[PDB]
Amino acid sequence: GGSVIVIDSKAAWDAQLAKGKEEHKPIVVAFTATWCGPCKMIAPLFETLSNDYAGKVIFLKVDVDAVAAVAEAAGITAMPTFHVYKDGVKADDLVGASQDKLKALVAKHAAA
């Protein structure tokens, strides 16, 4: 919506994690589902945040039903769930639709 990359496969998932390692930029991922109520509520903010940090942080979106393999390996159980990846590995997360916390997480990792 603002510069968010939609992940459609495990292959794209692996390519995008490598991009984050190659460009040395953190990645913030939103694990969402079409049936998820609070996910729809927070989705606009994530999109806005992707514009505001365009160039500093990479933003990915994963529809768990559409890409089960990724959702499963990522160990998600509640939605929405946000992960931060650095150098190919998970470095932080946030579970739930708290707007203030999502902002704090992005700001924290964007500011190096």
Q: Which two tokens stand for residue 18?
A: 């490598």
What gap in Å lies between CA 43 and CA 88, rounded to an integer?
24
> What separation in angstroms does the CA of 24 have from each of 3, 19, 68, 108?
18, 8, 27, 16
Which residue's entry shows tokens 């940090």? 53
CATH of the domain at 112: 3.40.30.10
Q: Is 36 a catalytic residue?
A: yes
Catalytic pick from 27, 39, 64, 102? Answer: 39
The count of structural domains within the chain is: 1
Does the annotation mark 80 as catalytic? no
Q: How was this structure determined?
A: X-ray
CA nearest 5: which of 88, 45, 61?
A: 61
User: What is the extent of the structural domain holding 101?
Assistant: 1-112
Residue among 7, 17, 36, 71 flagged as catalytic: 36
- Resolution of this model in Å is 2.2
- Residue 12, token pair as written in the block: 């794209």
